[model samples]
Target chain A: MLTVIAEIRTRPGQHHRQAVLDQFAKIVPTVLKEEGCHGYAPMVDCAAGVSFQSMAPDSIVMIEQWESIAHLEAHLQTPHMKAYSEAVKGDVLEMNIRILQPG
Target chain B: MLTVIAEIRTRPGQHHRQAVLDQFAKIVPTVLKEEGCHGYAPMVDCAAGVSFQSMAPDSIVMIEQWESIAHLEAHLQTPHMKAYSEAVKGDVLEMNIRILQPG
Candidate 1:
């Protein structure tokens, strides 16, 4: 299994926290329809924080699981993903993605 | 349920990738013993990468799942965790952690 982790922080003044999340909300259904997509979720920080972890107030974190790397590869190339990418172009400030599997 | 994602990049030269991984290997058994710890996996990137995600060559990424946020909080305060923190001191460069639930 492969888990895709994305930390998306929006550009200052150019994007609002809610808007970034809204963009992802639109893409969620399309993502879930893709093959090998086990789960997909976008998260915001809880009211109380994890003591040892840094929480970003301005970031939309995505946690996705796939059956294989090949399935995830196909996800990125889907038409909806491309449109989603273009939709957030300049408004996104920093995005860091990690592709990981069991140790 | 909550997923804890940690991205750890070691300080240049100060830490070797394998050494960092070794530290976690020592702690993994202890972590698994904690209550509500569903899964804990420290991962390295696969040779064939996901097209849209940026892969870090020198990072140790951990994907963890817990039954609840409370269980994760307790795990963080364990003696082994304290010891692990001491073990990694200056060898770690940048660490970004995200706590997430299903969308």
Candidate 2:
């Protein structure tokens, strides 16, 4: 399976995460309905006392799984995804996506 | 469940990734043997023609899952992990770890 680790960093000094998260919630079902979308989970930091952990309260890390590169590429250009992108453009400051395979 | 998204960035301008990956391979079995360590899979970027993808050739991203915060904290102090850290200290230039729960 193909994996995607996507970090969506919200704009600094603004309360944009809730809005972005709302939009993400809206698109998750549609994304999962696609042919190759296996997983699309968004997670946030929690209270932990691990010394080596670096918490990012401003970022949402999504662990996604797809069937193949072609599937992922197609999912990206879907109308729902395009709308999701347009809806959250103002709140999201950065998006770093890494398409990966098992090592 | 607790999840860890670890980005181990190799030293810039050096062939450090191979050594670091080798060290990671050594620790996987030991890490899995520990209590609460459910998943500790490392991933690397693969070839994809997606426009939104950001490939990180110098980084290895580990997606780990643990049973609880306490278990992960204990795992960090294990002897094998300490040795693993020591073995790749020079090769690894940066480590960004995000400890999170489902949100």
Candidate 3:
């Protein structure tokens, strides 16, 4: 299984981040249902003041396992991902993405 | 603790995904060392053929937590994240981000 971990941050706006977050919440199910999706969910930092805030500045983790590279390739062309992308139109700032083949 | 899970897709380019994966590998250490960083690593699917490939279609997951929201905020401003972000410059296509506060 290949997992993609991405750390993202907002552009500095209460409404902006919330709007994006809400939209993001709606798309989780779709991605999880993708061909190879294994796990999908959002995380938040819990501490003083912002104990319930989203993880990092605006981050998310996606774990999935495909039968093969070809399957993963085909998964991207699926309708679920297509509509998911449509949801996050504009509101991307800094993001750190990583792909891992667990040891 | 908060975990960020994101699913991303590339624009059909092996080199591009590899390049971004490389960049992500380089930044893992810095993120782990960040003030409130809990864990930072990549994952892959162990399936029939693509068992060794990086996580799902250019996907990545980030899990982290801070003593407070302020800590997370400060962590991002630190030099580690700064240098890390500098490394990823034009190797991103589609991304699905989510934030969660562990229950």
Candidate 4:
């Protein structure tokens, strides 16, 4: 199996973080349906970048695994994923995608 | 269940790296013996920092999930774990540990 992980550095005190999460929740159904998409998930790191004993937001990490490179490429073409990419384009600093194939 | 993840950044190109890993492999059996330790694993990212094409090695990421903070603390005191830590103290960089409780 091939694996893909996206290490996303999120924005600090982003007022629109909720909107980004909403978009993520909406996109899950489509992500689950993609061909060869083994898993697609987004999570916030509890202890990494920001913490405000009062008003800090969590940094998000996106992880996914695909069966093959072809399947992963196909995921990018799906309408749902394309929309997600478009929607959250500016909400984070960098989205690092790592694609791995078993050795 | 409680979760603890340690994001370990590894030293590149150390002859002792393998020895460190061997020490790590040895610690696994002891780690597993802990009551709440679900998993204690070390892995290298497929696409980060080092590249063997340039005589470099991959940075390691250690992940573990425990049942509770108390159980985790107990694991740290175990003989095998203490031995493992002492053996590889200088072989690693900062180990970022995140402890999470159920929300």
lDDT of each: 0.77, 0.87, 0.54, 0.62
Measured by TM-score, the strongest candidate is 2
Clashing pairs in 4: none
lDDT of 4 by residue, A1-103 (tens): 7545455555667545666778888887788887897877765544423231111244554556688766877777888877887888777666656554321
Estimate, for each residue in B1-103, the C-alpha lDDT of model 2 and write its tens digit.
9998888898866668878888878889889989999999889898687678898888899999999888988988999989988998988888888898766
- Over the true interface, candidate 4 deviates by an RMSD, in Å, of 7.9
Q: Which window of 10 residues has the lowest lDDT sum in candidate 1 chain A?
A: A45-54
Off by over 4 Å in 3: A48-55, A61-68, B1-103
Q: Tens digit of lDDT per residue, candidate 3, span B1-103?
A: 5454444444455666666667767777776777767765554333434333333555443434445455667866877667655654566665544445632
Best by lDDT: 2
DockQ of each: 0.48, 0.76, 0.16, 0.24
For residues A1-103, could you state the per-residue lDDT of candidate 3 as single tens digits?
5544444555665565566667667776776677666765554433334433323545333334444456666766877666655666566565544445542
What is the lDDT for B77 in model 1?
88
- Poorest 10 consecutive residues of model 2 chain B by lDDT? B12-21
Question: Between candidates 1 and 4, which one is better according to TM-score?
Answer: 1
Q: Give the CAPRI class of candidate 3.
A: incorrect
Question: How do these models rank on DockQ, best leading?
Answer: 2, 1, 4, 3
Model 1 DockQ (Cα-based): 0.48
Per-model TM against the reference: 0.76, 0.89, 0.44, 0.73
Model 1's interface RMSD = 2.5
Ranking by TM-score: 2, 1, 4, 3
User: Comparing candidate 1 with candidate 4, which one achieves the higher lDDT?
Assistant: 1
- Candidate 2: tens digits of C-alpha lDDT, residues A1-103: 9999989998766668878888888888888899998989989898677577898888998999999887888988899889988998888989888899877
